[PDB]
Amino acid sequence: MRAKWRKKRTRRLKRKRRKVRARSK
Amino acid sequence: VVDPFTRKEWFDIKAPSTFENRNVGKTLVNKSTGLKSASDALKGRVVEVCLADLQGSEDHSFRKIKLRVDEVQGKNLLTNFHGMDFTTDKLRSMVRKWQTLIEANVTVKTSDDYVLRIFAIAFTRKQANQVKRHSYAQSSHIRAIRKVISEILTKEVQGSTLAQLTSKLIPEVINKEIENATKDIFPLQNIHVRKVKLLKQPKFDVGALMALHG
Amino acid sequence: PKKRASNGRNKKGRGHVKPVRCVNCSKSIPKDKAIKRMAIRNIVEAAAVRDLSEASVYPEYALPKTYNKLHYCVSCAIHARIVRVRSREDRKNRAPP
Amino acid sequence: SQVFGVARIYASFNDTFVHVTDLSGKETIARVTGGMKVKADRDESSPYAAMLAAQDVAAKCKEVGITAVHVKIRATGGTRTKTPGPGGQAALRALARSGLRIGRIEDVTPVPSDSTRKKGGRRGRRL
Amino acid sequence: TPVTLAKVIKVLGRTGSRGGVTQVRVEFLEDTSRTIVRNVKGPVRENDILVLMESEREARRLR
RNA sequence: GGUGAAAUUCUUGGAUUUAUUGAAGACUAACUACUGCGAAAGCAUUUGCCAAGGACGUUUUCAUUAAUCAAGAACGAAAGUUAGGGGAUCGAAGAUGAUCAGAUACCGUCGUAGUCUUAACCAUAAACUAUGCCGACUAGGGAUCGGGUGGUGUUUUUUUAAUGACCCACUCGGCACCUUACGAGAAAUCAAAGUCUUUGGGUUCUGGGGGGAGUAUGGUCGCAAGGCUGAAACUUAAAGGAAUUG
RNA sequence: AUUAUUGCUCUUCAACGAGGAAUUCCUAGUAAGCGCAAGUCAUCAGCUUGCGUUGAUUACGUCCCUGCCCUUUGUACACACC
Ligand SMILES: [Mg+2]
Ligand SMILES: [Mg+2]
Ligand SMILES: [Mg+2]
Ligand SMILES: [Mg+2]
Ligand SMILES: [Mg+2]
Ligand SMILES: [Mg+2]
Ligand SMILES: [Mg+2]
Ligand SMILES: [Mg+2]
Ligand SMILES: [Mg+2]
Ligand SMILES: [Mg+2]
Ligand SMILES: [Mg+2]
Ligand SMILES: [Mg+2]
Ligand SMILES: [Mg+2]
Ligand SMILES: [Mg+2]
Ligand SMILES: [Mg+2]
Ligand SMILES: [Mg+2]
Ligand SMILES: [Mg+2]
Ligand SMILES: [Mg+2]
Ligand SMILES: [Mg+2]
Ligand SMILES: [Zn+2]
Numbered sequence: 001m002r003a004k005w006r007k008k009r010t011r012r013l014k015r016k017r018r019k020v021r022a023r024s025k
Numbered sequence: 026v027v028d029p030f031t032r033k034e035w036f037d038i039k040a041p042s043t044f045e046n047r048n049v050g051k052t053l054v055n056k057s058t059g060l061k062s063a064s065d066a067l068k069g070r071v072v073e074v075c076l077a078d079l080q081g082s083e084d085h086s087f088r089k090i091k092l093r094v095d096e097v098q099g100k101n102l103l104t105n106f107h108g109m110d111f112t113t114d115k116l117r118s119m120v121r122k123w124q125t126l127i128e129a130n131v132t133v134k135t136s137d138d139y140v141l142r143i144f145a146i147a148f149t150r151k152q153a154n155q156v157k158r159h160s161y162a163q164s165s166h167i168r169a170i171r172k173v174i175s176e177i178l179t180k181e182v183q184g185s186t187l188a189q190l191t192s193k194l195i196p197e198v199i200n201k202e203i204e205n206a207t208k209d210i211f212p213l214q215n216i217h218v219r220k221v222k223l224l225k226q227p228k229f230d231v232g233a234l235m236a237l238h239g
Numbered sequence: 240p241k242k243r244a245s246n247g248r249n250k251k252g253r254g255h256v257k258p259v260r261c262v263n264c265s266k267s268i269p270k271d272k273a274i275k276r277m278a279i280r281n282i283v284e285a286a287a288v289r290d291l292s293e294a295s296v297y298p299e300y301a302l303p304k305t306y307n308k309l310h311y312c313v314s315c316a317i318h319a320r321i322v323r324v325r326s327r328e329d330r331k332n333r334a335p336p
Numbered sequence: 337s338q339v340f341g342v343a344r345i346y347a348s349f350n351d352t353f354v355h356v357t358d359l360s361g362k363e364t365i366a367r368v369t370g371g372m373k374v375k376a377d378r379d380e381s382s383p384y385a386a387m388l389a390a391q392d393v394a395a396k397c398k399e400v401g402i403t404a405v406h407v408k409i410r411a412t413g414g415t416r417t418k419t420p421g422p423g424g425q426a427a428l429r430a431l432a433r434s435g436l437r438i439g440r441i442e443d444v445t446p447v448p449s450d451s452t453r454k455k456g457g458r459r460g461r462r463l
Numbered sequence: 464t465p466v467t468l469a470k471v472i473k474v475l476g477r478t479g480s481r482g483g484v485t486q487v488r489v490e491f492l493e494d495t496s497r498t499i500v501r502n503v504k505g506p507v508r509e510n511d512i513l514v515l516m517e518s519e520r521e522a523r524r525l526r
Numbered sequence: 527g528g529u530g531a532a533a534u535u536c537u538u539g540g541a542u543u544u545a546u547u548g549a550a551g552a553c554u555a556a557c558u559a560c561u562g563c564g565a566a567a568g569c570a571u572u573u574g575c576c577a578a579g580g581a582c583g584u585u586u587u588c589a590u591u592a593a594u595c596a597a598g599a600a601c602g603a604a605a606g607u608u609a610g611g612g613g614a615u616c617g618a619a620g621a622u623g624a625u626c627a628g629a630u631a632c633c634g635u636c637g638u639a640g641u642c643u644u645a646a647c648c649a650u651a652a653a654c655u656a657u658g659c660c661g662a663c664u665a666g667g668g669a670u671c672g673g674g675u676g677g678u679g680u681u682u683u684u685u686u687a688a689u690g691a692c693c694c695a696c697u698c699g700g701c702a703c704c705u706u707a708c709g710a711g712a713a714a715u716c717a718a719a720g721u722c723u724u725u726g727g728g729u730u731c732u733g734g735g736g737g738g739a740g741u742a743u744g745g746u747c748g749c750a751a752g753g754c755u756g757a758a759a760c761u762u763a764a765a766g767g768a769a770u771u772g
Numbered sequence: 773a774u775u776a777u778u779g780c781u782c783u784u785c786a787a788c789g790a791g792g793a794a795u796u797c798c799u800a801g802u803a804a805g806c807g808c809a810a811g812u813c814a815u816c817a818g819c820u821u822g823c824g825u826u827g828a829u830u831a832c833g834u835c836c837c838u839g840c841c842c843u844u845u846g847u848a849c850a851c852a853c854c
Binding site: 067069070071093116117119120121122123124125126127128129130148149151152153154155156157158159160161162164168171172175208209210211212 | 546557561571681
Binding site for chain 3: 569
C-alpha cells in the first residue's frame with residue numbers, strides 16, 4: 001500500500017495501543 | 026394578450042455641449058400615466074457611446090463616454106458628463122511583454138464640486154537604437170514617474186468642472202505634459218488617461234446644467 | 240532518474256512562485272511551470288468579415304481582436320494543446336514555432 | 337442614419353444569449369436564446385440554434401422600431417472560462433446578414449484583477 | 464439566370480477527408496484576367512470547363 | 527443551469543439576461559521573464575512611516591577579532607489546536623443526483639469545519655538543487671541583474687551644454703543558459719559530482735544488505751493531534767541503482 | 773432404394789410483388805451473367821478446383837471508418853498485459 005496510508009495505518013494503531021494501555025495505568 | 030410595443034412611449038437622446046453630434050439616439054419608456062409616469066420614474070439613465078461616434082473622427086476609436094440624463098423636456102431629454110472609459114481591446118493591445126507597465130491615480134475635486142478619480146497608464150518604450158531585447162525601468166524610475174503623473178493630474182483637474190476638464194481630456198493635453206515632464210526620467214510610450222469615474226456630484230442646480238444647452 | 244534540468248519547469252533563484260489555475264480543468268499549478276498561450280484572434284472570423292463590413296455603417300470600420308492569456312496544466316497541455324511528447328533530444332529545444 | 341440600440345451577446349458554452357436593449361440599457365427590446373429554438377439540452381449552445389435566435393431577435397428588432405445596433409459580445413467570465421462560446425460568432429453574422437446595421441463592437445467579458453478561489457479544487461476537475 | 468464559365472488552369476490537389484474532392488484554380492473565359500479556386504466533385508485535369516453556377520465565392524479546406 | 531450524456535436544482539417568486547446603485551470579505555489578473563530580493567519558510571496595487579541588507583566605490587578605520595560547529599536557541603509552507611472577531615469565495619465531513627455488477631469514489635448539487643484576522647499553540651513537507659559550510663586551483667562562449675571606470679559613441683534641442691535613456695570596451699559581485707572535457711562516474715550525467723590507489727587545505731553531519739520498523743520500551747516536549755530521542759527477538763538471498771535490448 | 777439415391781411423365785401450383793437493422797466482394801477481358809470438364813463417384817452437386825463463352829458502370833484518390841505496420845514515448849513487464 002501507498003506509504004502514506006501505511007503511515008496513517010500505524011498512526012491509528014498507536015492511538016489504539018495508547019488507548020488500551022491506559023485502561024491499566 | 027398585450028404587446029407593450031402597442032403601449033410604449035418613445036424618445037430620442039441628446040448629448041451635451043463640447044463634442045460633435047448632440048443628437049445621440051433613441052429610447053423607449055412607458056406613457057406618462059397618472060400614478061407611475063414617463064417622467065420622474067426613469068429618464069435619468071446613462072448612455073455609453075464611443076466618442077468617435079460622438080466626434081466622427083476615428084483617431085478616437087477607443088475612449089468611451091458615460092452620458093447621464095438629468096433633465097427632460099417633452100421628447101427632448103438632455104445629458105451631462107458621467108465618466109470616461111477605454112475600450113477593452115485597445116488596452117489589451119498596449120500590454121505587450123518585455124516592457125514595464127505603469128499606472129497611477131488620484132481622487133480629486135473640481136470647481137463645480139464634482140469629485141472624481143482619474144487614471145493614467147504608460148509603458149516603457151525601447152530606445153530607437155537599443156540592442157537589449159526588453160527595456161525595463163527601475164522602480165526608482167517608476168516611483169518618480171507616478172509621483173509626477175500624480176502631480177500633473179491633481180493640477181489639471183480643479184479646472185472649470187468636468188466641463189473644462191472634459192474640454193481638457195478630448196484633445197489630450199494631459200497625455201503630452203506627462204510625456205514632457207517624463208522624458209527626463211525614462212522614455213515611455215502610449216501614456217493615456219485611460220479612465221475617470223464620478224463618485225460624488227454636488228447638487229442638481231438646474232441652471233448650470235442648462236448652460237451646456239442651445 | 241532525473242529527466243530534466245529545468246525539473247518540472249523554470250525555477251532557479253527563488254523557492255516559491257505562486258499557483259495559477261488551469262484554464263481547462265482548474266488544476267492549480269505553479270506559475271513558472273504553467274505552460275501558456277496568448278489567444279489573440281479577431282472578434283469576427285474567416286467568413287463573417289466580408290458580411291461584417293457589408294451590413295455596417297462606417298468605412299471598413301477598424302476591427303479589434305481579443306487578447307487573452309491561457310494557463311494550462313501539463314495534463315491539459317498534453318491532452319490537447321502544446322505537447323506532442325518529444326524525443327530525448329527534441330525535449331532540450333526551447334525554440335517555439 | 338439609423339436608429340441605434342445595443343445588441344449585447346452573452347455566449348457561454350451550453351447556451352448562447354442574444355438580446356437587444358435601448359442604448360441606455362434600462363429598457364430592453366426582445367431577447368430569445370439558443371435554448372429556445374431547439375429541444376435537446378445537449379444542443380443548446382450550437383451555432384445552428386444561435387442562428388435561429390439571431391433570426392427571431394432580428395424580426396422583433398425591426399418590428400418594433402430599431403434599424404441598427406452596436407454589439408457587446410461576452411463570455412462567461414469571472415473565475416470561469418474567459419473564452420468565447422461557439423454560438424456567439426454565428427449569432428453575430430446571422431444578425432448582420434439579417435439586414436441590420438453594425439457599428440463598433442467591443443468585448444465585455446468580466447475579467448477580475450484576479451481572485452476568488454476558482455471552483456473545482458486544487459487537484460483539478462479530473463476525468 | 465446567368466451562366467459563368469471558368470477553365471481549369473491548375474490542379475492543386477485533393478481535400479475532403481474521404482478525398483473525392485479536388486481543389487483547382489480556374490480562369491473565366493467571358494472576361495479572363497481574374498482567377499478563383501474551386502472544389503470539384505468528379506475527376507479533373509487541366510483545361511476542363513466548370514459551370515460555376517455562381518461566380519464569386521471560393522473555398523479552401525474540406526473536413 | 528450543469529455534463530461525454532443526464533438528473534438532482536431555479537423558474538408569476540418574472541428566473542437566466544439587462545440596467546442604475548449599495549454592502550461584505552478575499553485577492554492582486556494582464557505587465558511576469560530560464561528576471562529581482564530574503565537565513566530558509568517565503569516575498570508582486572498605491573502612498574506614509576519604522577528599522578534592516580547585499581553588492582559596488584573606497585590612498586578611511588580596527589588589526590587576527592576568524593572557519594566550522596555536539597549542547598542550547600531564533601525563524602519555520604499547508605493542515606491542525608485554544609480564545610475572540612470575520613465568515614464574499616472555494617470548500618475535508620455529511621447529505622444528495624447520476625454512473626457502476628457494486629461505487630462508501632471519480633462527475634453534478636446542497637454544504638459543516640476550514641479558508642481571512644488578532645492573541646496564543648503546533649514544528650512538520652518530495653521544507654528539493656533529493657547535492658553541508660569556508661578556502662585554493664583547473665576551460666571556452668554569448669546573453670542578463672546590480673555597482674563602478676573608460677569614449678572628440680548614438681539619441682533627446684535651446685544656443686551649445688548639464689541631465690536622462692541608449693551603444694561599445696572593461697571590471698567586481700548575482701540569477702542562469704550554451705559548447706566542451708584535460709578530468710570524474712556504475713551509468714544518467716557533472717565547472718563540480720574535477721584537481722582520489724600518483725589515495726591528506728579546514729570543519730560539521732549522516733549511512734554500513736533487505737524486511738521486522740520509525741514498530742516496542744524509557745525519557746522528554748505538546749491542550750490534542752502528535753514532535754524529538756529510539757531498540758531487539760524473529761525472518762530473509764536478495765531488496766536496490768543506472769543503462770541496454772525486447 | 774422403406775425414412776422416399778438419381779432419371780422421366782401426368783397432376784398438384786405454396787411463399788415470393790426487390791427485401792428493416794445491418795453486411796460481403798470487386799478496378800479490365802476484371803465485375804456480373806452463362807455453361808462445361810475435373811475431384812468425389814456403383815448411384816447421387818444446389819459443393820469445390822479449374823476452364824472458356826457474353827461482357828459493363830465507376831475510381832486511378834484518400835486517412836473518414838476499420839485492420840495493420842513504422843517511429844517517438846512510459847514501464848516496477850522479460851513466463852513479457854492471458
Ligand atoms: Mg477504568
Ligand atoms: Mg530506470
Ligand atoms: Mg520514471
Ligand atoms: Mg519550497
Ligand atoms: Mg484523464
Ligand atoms: Mg497588479
Ligand atoms: Mg543541533
Ligand atoms: Mg544535556
Ligand atoms: Mg465559511
Ligand atoms: Mg461523500
Ligand atoms: Mg447512492
Ligand atoms: Mg462516506
Ligand atoms: Mg523530515
Ligand atoms: Mg524540487
Ligand atoms: Mg566560465
Ligand atoms: Mg558611463
Ligand atoms: Mg527502455
Ligand atoms: Mg461430376
Ligand atoms: Mg464437400
Ligand atoms: Zn488542466
